[PDB]
Design a protein around this ligand. Sequence first.
Ligand SMILES: CC(C)CCC[C@@H](C)[C@H]1CC[C@H]2[C@@H]3CC=C4C[C@@H](OC(=O)CCC(=O)O)CC[C@]4(C)[C@H]3CC[C@]12C
Ligand SMILES: CC(C)CCC[C@@H](C)[C@H]1CC[C@H]2[C@@H]3CC=C4C[C@@H](OC(=O)CCC(=O)O)CC[C@]4(C)[C@H]3CC[C@]12C
Ligand SMILES: CC(C)CCC[C@@H](C)[C@H]1CC[C@H]2[C@@H]3CC=C4C[C@@H](OC(=O)CCC(=O)O)CC[C@]4(C)[C@H]3CC[C@]12C
Ligand SMILES: CC(C)CCC[C@@H](C)[C@H]1CC[C@H]2[C@@H]3CC=C4C[C@@H](OC(=O)CCC(=O)O)CC[C@]4(C)[C@H]3CC[C@]12C
Ligand SMILES: CC(C)CCC[C@@H](C)[C@H]1CC[C@H]2[C@@H]3CC=C4C[C@@H](O)CC[C@]4(C)[C@H]3CC[C@]12C
Ligand SMILES: CC(C)CCC[C@@H](C)[C@H]1CC[C@H]2[C@@H]3CC=C4C[C@@H](O)CC[C@]4(C)[C@H]3CC[C@]12C
Ligand SMILES: CC(C)CCC[C@@H](C)[C@H]1CC[C@H]2[C@@H]3CC=C4C[C@@H](O)CC[C@]4(C)[C@H]3CC[C@]12C
Ligand SMILES: [Ca+2]
Ligand SMILES: [Ca+2]
Ligand SMILES: [Ca+2]
Ligand SMILES: [Ca+2]
Ligand SMILES: [Ca+2]
Lengths: 148, 650, 614
Amino acid sequence: ADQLTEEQIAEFKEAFSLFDKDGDGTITTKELGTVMRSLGQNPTEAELQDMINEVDADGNGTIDFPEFLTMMARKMKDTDSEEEIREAFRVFDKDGNGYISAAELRHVMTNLGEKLTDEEVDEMIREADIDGDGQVNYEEFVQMMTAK
Amino acid sequence: RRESWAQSRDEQNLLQQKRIWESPLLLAAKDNDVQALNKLLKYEDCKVHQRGAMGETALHIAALYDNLEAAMVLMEAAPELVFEPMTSELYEGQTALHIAVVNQNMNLVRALLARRASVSARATGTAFRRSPRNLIYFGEHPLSFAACVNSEEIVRLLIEHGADIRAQDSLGNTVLHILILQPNKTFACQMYNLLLSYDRHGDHLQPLDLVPNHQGLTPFKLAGVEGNTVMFQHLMQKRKHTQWTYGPLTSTLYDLTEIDSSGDEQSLLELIITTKKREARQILDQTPVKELVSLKWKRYGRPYFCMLGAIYLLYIICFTMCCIYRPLKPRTNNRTSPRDNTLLQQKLLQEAYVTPKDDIRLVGELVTVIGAIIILLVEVPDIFRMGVTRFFGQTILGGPFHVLIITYAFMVLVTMVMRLISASGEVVPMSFALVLGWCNVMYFARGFQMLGPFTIMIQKMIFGDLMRFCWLMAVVILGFASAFYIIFQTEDPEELGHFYDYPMALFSTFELFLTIIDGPANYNVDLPFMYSITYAAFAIIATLLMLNLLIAMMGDTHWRVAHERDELWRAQIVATTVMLERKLPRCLWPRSGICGREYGLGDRWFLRVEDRQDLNRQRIQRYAQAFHTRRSTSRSSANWERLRQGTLRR
Amino acid sequence: RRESWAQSRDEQNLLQQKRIWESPLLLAAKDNDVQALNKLLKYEDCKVHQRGAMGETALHIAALYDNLEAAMVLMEAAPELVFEPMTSELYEGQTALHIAVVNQNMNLVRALLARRASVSARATGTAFRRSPRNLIYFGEHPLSFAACVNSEEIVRLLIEHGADIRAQDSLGNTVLHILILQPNKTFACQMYNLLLSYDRHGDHLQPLDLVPNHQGLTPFKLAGVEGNTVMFQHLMQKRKHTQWTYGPLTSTLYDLTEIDSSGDEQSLLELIITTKKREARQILDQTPVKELVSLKWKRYGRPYFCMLGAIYLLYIICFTMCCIYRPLKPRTNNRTSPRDNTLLQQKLLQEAYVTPKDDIRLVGELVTVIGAIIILLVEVPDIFRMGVTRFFGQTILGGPFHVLIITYAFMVLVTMVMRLISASGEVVPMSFALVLGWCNVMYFARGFQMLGPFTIMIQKMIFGDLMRFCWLMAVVILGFASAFYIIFQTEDPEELGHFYDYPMALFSTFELFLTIIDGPANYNVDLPFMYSITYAAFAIIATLLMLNLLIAMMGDTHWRVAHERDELWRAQIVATTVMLERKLPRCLWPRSGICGREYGLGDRWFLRVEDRQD
Ligand SMILES: CC(C)CCC[C@@H](C)[C@H]1CC[C@H]2[C@@H]3CC=C4C[C@@H](OC(=O)CCC(=O)O)CC[C@]4(C)[C@H]3CC[C@]12C
Ligand SMILES: CC(C)CCC[C@@H](C)[C@H]1CC[C@H]2[C@@H]3CC=C4C[C@@H](OC(=O)CCC(=O)O)CC[C@]4(C)[C@H]3CC[C@]12C
Ligand SMILES: CC(C)CCC[C@@H](C)[C@H]1CC[C@H]2[C@@H]3CC=C4C[C@@H](OC(=O)CCC(=O)O)CC[C@]4(C)[C@H]3CC[C@]12C
Ligand SMILES: CC(C)CCC[C@@H](C)[C@H]1CC[C@H]2[C@@H]3CC=C4C[C@@H](OC(=O)CCC(=O)O)CC[C@]4(C)[C@H]3CC[C@]12C
Ligand SMILES: CC(C)CCC[C@@H](C)[C@H]1CC[C@H]2[C@@H]3CC=C4C[C@@H](O)CC[C@]4(C)[C@H]3CC[C@]12C
Ligand SMILES: CC(C)CCC[C@@H](C)[C@H]1CC[C@H]2[C@@H]3CC=C4C[C@@H](O)CC[C@]4(C)[C@H]3CC[C@]12C
Ligand SMILES: CC(C)CCC[C@@H](C)[C@H]1CC[C@H]2[C@@H]3CC=C4C[C@@H](O)CC[C@]4(C)[C@H]3CC[C@]12C
Ligand SMILES: [Ca+2]
Ligand SMILES: [Ca+2]
Ligand SMILES: [Ca+2]
Ligand SMILES: [Ca+2]
Ligand SMILES: [Ca+2]
């Protein structure tokens, strides 16, 4: 959406993945209602029709990933970071996917000496992880490098 | 011979700049100078086809230095200006349309397509070919440029004005091959989905994501060989066929028509193992491929690798006991070489198998010669085929255990010669054939998870922190061995005989380096005075300095490469299963997976994986609310700040 | 070793997708297709008992593949499908109410209970029993399904329609047993309050949190065995009792009625040390446990284990000095079996019990033989009843000190038998019995904090860092000792006799691998040429490469598992304190805690503690 970097797109694509439970790139009105029921709240089957036809610019009723990606620009989070931190994450992130791993922090500590064991590396992530996946986002990494 | 290349490219870039200043219109084109272009182009002698140092006209300089106002003046005055590709051995083919594309934004690209542009222009020169060379590989055709610069507005603008979405390259790469081997992977995924949208179901016989290059390799297998983990997860979403979701329990159904080892078509597991580029081994930890190798190893891979680990181990014992019970005959003449230099008292029989004990060995010796030929008929057809030593730069450098087992079956057939032609030196080829023979038992220690990552570490010391040590050992034991020799050259070698011969003085000094003998001491004859000094220096910088530093090198390395060896071990399970699947017949190895004839899914083989997925309400709350429209911590947090100023200050 | 259970499920899971495609009503039930349902249900060729692969009908497919509009058509047309369980072996008894609950909500759970569903069904199929063969263990009952997927709106809705709050399962696990051993520890705590709150009956009878499963474990003690630490601290909120609060200094009383071993039952300190899970041993560092472990050990656990170490220390000296002062007479035979290869000059005697020195020694054998019977009557009747070398042979599997003390007492009696019937060489049972009998003093080094976590690292370095090293030691030395043998075979054995025969060649080469002899070097005679090459290569795969790699490998592991070897030592205090609690008589041994009779709280024992929290 004309400003989106490689990080937020790699986060939104994984966010599109667990939200879609048939493997393709089409969000049906039904499979949106599958997630909504798991939030405890119930749909009304017209609320599902409300949220799809809000942004379905092509007119198919199935939310494709470009129409999903410009939707998260409307419901945007924010853009406030530093240019040195975003470069520092791409040095750490080896396989270009917008996430740091347990084996991608044992590499960075090894270059700095530091003699880390496998147990503290999993204890670093538990203070870095917010949503609870054992996998540091970009927003989880910016939140640690300047704040706590 | 090869460093003139780096000069001659830099000769052209300065010669290009000099031709700009010694020209009225090119200097006018490098800047805007819109008053000056109208001044010059009303003349007669102005060559508008002026060739610079590469073939550049005024419009290229207006485009490369992105002067769109100077571009409008030149298109009115010169008709054949969207044409005329460059000529020199560098950039060829490249018109003004390519340069307007590569800059990620121009109004010139809307202007040049109006002025009858040329989108078939193969930009084939020595500056658009991938190699340890030019920093970029964007492609050949103008659509291939617009794709790999992240230009979503230009690719839509190219296909409308009569483009070609299918056309290959000199390498044979299509458009979708170029998107895979870019260094910006997540923007390549959005361009991947866009370039398939304008395919519009061509009748072109496997439409454009199955078409191979000149190697013969699909886009799906190009994410695997190169190392694209981001593309390989994206390309897999067309393959899965997810069955049901019983709450927090899914059941997907992957497509093993290109992953699993097929017939004579080289499958995807056969291409990763025979490839460099360490990021390619990251594919072996992916959700259809990790579950495939583990189900080919627990079932059919390990019980066959132990029945070859036991036939070979009963082969060496049959070969060992034919060396222990080898024929010897007592010494003939009578100690003819003089005393104190001769103590051998047996010799080797000419031909004597005439006793019932030797016919038992004759059974055993024929086993290890038949078995020696079989080793040279399953692996030597790879050195018969792929080169002797000059074309054969692949398997020598790749597999260490290839060399030791060809050497073993060579030493047996040296001993086969010397037993028949009745030679003398048979104790030498049986000296190799035993240490070479028993150290291939180390090969059959990769399936056992206990012994697996230990043989990985040994070959990373031999080709690592021991030949970093063996050069600065041979420096020391050529200095001191020539120092201990010349001191004891003027002495009596009958109470201290460690140094009386310069081949011998190399041998005792090497042992004192390792302390695997005691040390020259007599305690009855007053030694030379210089020995007590030069051995005292040799005791410090061998036993106290350089050997304890070698413990510090192997101890520093072993905690650094300590998760790479668990990546290297699980990539040798794949290298074993693929090898065992090939050389064994199909009657013992069932094809892995579930067929699709009787279940009505086609001819392709499937593999079902079920996984209890997840929770984290907190994650999905953040995205559905957008949809909703109208102490060990103190140890860990201390480790974050040591990374924090460790990063922001570098 | 094919996993035929993995094939047998995969042959059926693809078969279910086949049966739906070759059926008009099931395919229409996979989608919504309400236009397609009303056409097929009118014609009387419906076959509503169309039975699929996993015994499913059109109502199971409409509930598994979520189709609320399809299920309304099916219940309205043929309402007898609600009372229909599946019949296949994996999914036995799984009704339509089971499936619609695991999809976390529907309006179908309103609609199925409208048309009389079964709130008390049995999902007794083999794909619901807990195993390493099923990804889920949700229980068997619908209120056990809804409680595990964290759905409060469904759990409140099943009790209103008649759920049984205390209905046990095949393993006897009730609803409160299952929530503990679910992998989401946080949301299990939120359901644990809602489930107990809806009991409130006067028909308690070991009410709801005092009801054990089939193996006897209560809900509180099940968190002990499994390892759910988050559930454990939530369970302790009902056992404790605040006493007084004076500034920043509070005093509570924990309830040692299910933690401390009384005299008969298997308590929580016993169940942790018998199980083998590594998440089970964070319960040793919790707020009622880390005192009761320490206060038994400081007061009555260390002095009884040092007196029991000092009796065994004076026991093994009386076994040593009856081996130092053996009856041993000079040789009677002429030597005559070449003195070129013979050194023996003493023989065993038959009856030397006559001197007053031997009568004092005859006390010393009688001490160590009776002591070898007391060993075999306190430890060998343990492996008789508990398990045939496997269940109480977990010490034959880990913590090897049980095997050694049996092997000591097994070979004092072989030393007795060879003395009595006067057999040949007695040195062979004795030579084991010393090195076995002294290396059990290393058992009594777990109480001393200096020697405690170092006896751990002789165990974890001999079962995985020296054991994996010896498989590539016997590869190397079998290669070279056979190589060094055939070189020194056409050669003089009296000088450099390191390799004169093949059992000795295995023992010279094993010693050169470790540098515990010098090296075959016999200047003033010339060795063959091939030796100095093949010993130079055995000077490197050797002292140089594979002896300094073992220093690095033991040096790598000694800081990787350094957090573990401490908390593996603290579980060797619980393993010893509770062992002395049941083998010693009750008489010395005061019971740990303050009784609640003389002050009045009941008959339960207690234990108080004070702390600052600011
Ligand atoms: C006469 C009787 C006893 C039969 C003798 C046959 C076997 C004892 C031999 C002959 C062929 C041998 C095999 C030939 C080929 C190979 C592959 C070879 O693979 C490698 O070296 C790969 C190394 C790498 O990939 O890095 C390892 C030994 C092995 C299994 C050999 C194991 C021992 C075998 C089965
Ligand atoms: C290439 C690998 C094996 C390691 C290289 C290390 C070198 C520094 C070592 C190992 C091989 C050694 C050589 C192997 C062979 C010989 C011949 C041998 O000389 C004799 O013939 C001695 C006479 C006798 O043994 O009676 C011993 C010295 C020498 C030069 C050795 C000197 C020290 C060397 C060069
Ligand atoms: C920082 C410094 C103190 C380094 C420590 C090194 C010393 C402990 C060592 C290194 C050199 C050694 C010396 C090397 C040579 C000799 C000569 C040696 O020969 C004789 O004087 C005897 C003459 C003979 O052998 O016939 C006697 C020991 C001595 C002094 C050694 C004594 C111990 C020394 C001083
Ligand atoms: C004739 C007189 C002097 C006999 C003296 C008695 C001692 C020599 C023996 C008899 C019984 C023995 C005990 C028998 C049982 C055990 C349990 C035993 O535990 C194990 O073998 C390992 C179990 C674990 O892993 O904890 C440790 C030694 C101990 C206390 C023994 C200590 C030494 C004792 C007291
Ligand atoms: C006394 C005679 C016979 C021998 C004594 C040897 C001494 C004087 C010589 C020989 C070997 C030498 C060392 C060899 C290697 C190094 C490492 C290099 O980076 C700096 C010099 C240094 C540190 C040398 C210092 C001096 C040294 C120790
Ligand atoms: C063969 C005869 C002569 C000698 C017997 C030696 C062997 C069998 C004995 C003697 C020393 C013993 C070890 C000594 C102590 C420990 C530490 C303990 O935490 C685990 C067991 C372990 C590692 C023992 C295992 C068995 C052992 C290795
Ligand atoms: C010269 C003759 C007499 C004996 C010499 C033996 C030498 C050349 C042979 C025998 C044993 C061999 C080693 C045995 C084990 C391994 C580990 C493997 O992962 C890589 C190869 C490596 C490191 C071999 C390299 C070559 C080697 C050292
Ligand atoms: Ca969908
Ligand atoms: Ca759409
Ligand atoms: Ca990553
Ligand atoms: Ca995260
Ligand atoms: Ca020595």
